């Protein structure tokens, strides 16, 4: 018999195809309380949902929630939030790519509420041909101040 078990890994883990390895609980000889150590070999690019496989277990790789990237197959999207001001006058933040490198983001021109920037070959690797990566997309999400004061309104001209 085969039972499904979910295995939350991280985008970074899947990216490098790390030899993630953990122990899982089961029964044993004549009813018991065990914990057996298993070894999973991830592969650069593995998409969640993939599965690698006494008793029998069916493992389904699962993408943990990354604090900066939202994945799209082979593409990676990063949503850089922006203060109202820096949304029309410019900004000079800095972001960390999926592989540790830090990337300088910067404008001196207003940016459209959902305007994006695509960086080729800077996303997750492609499972089939891994020597190829998808690409990073950085989305600017401008933040509006709630109710605005008198000066504010008057100024808007």
């Amino acid at each position: 018999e085969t039972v499904q078990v979910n295995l939350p890994v991280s985008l970074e883990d899947l990216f490098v195809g790390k030899k993630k390895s953990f122990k899982i609980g089961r029964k044993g000889p004549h009813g018991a309380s065990e914990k057996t150590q298993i070894d999973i070999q991830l592969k650069p690019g593995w998409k969640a949902g993939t599965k690698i496989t006494r008793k029998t277990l069916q493992f389904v790789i699962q993408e943990k929630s990354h604090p900066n990237f939202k994945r799209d197959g082979d593409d990676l999207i990063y949503t850089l939030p922006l203060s109202f001001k820096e949304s029309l006058l410019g900004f000079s933040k800095t972001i960390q790519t999926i592989d540790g490198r830090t990337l300088p983001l910067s404008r001196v021109q207003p940016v459209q509420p959902s305007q994006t920037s695509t960086y080729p070959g800077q996303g997750m690797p492609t499972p089939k041909n891994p020597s190829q990566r998808g690409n990073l997309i950085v989305k600017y999400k401008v933040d509006y101040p709630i109710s605005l004061n008198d000066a504010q309104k008057r100024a808007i001209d």
């Binding site: 039972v3 078990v5 979910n6 295995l7 390895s21 953990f22 122990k23 899982i24 609980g25 089961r26 914990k35 150590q37 277990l57």
Partner: peptide, 7 residues
């Protein structure tokens, strides 16, 4: 529901 244990 088994017991997942990372490593």
């Amino acid at each position: 529901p088994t017991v997942e244990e990372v490593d």
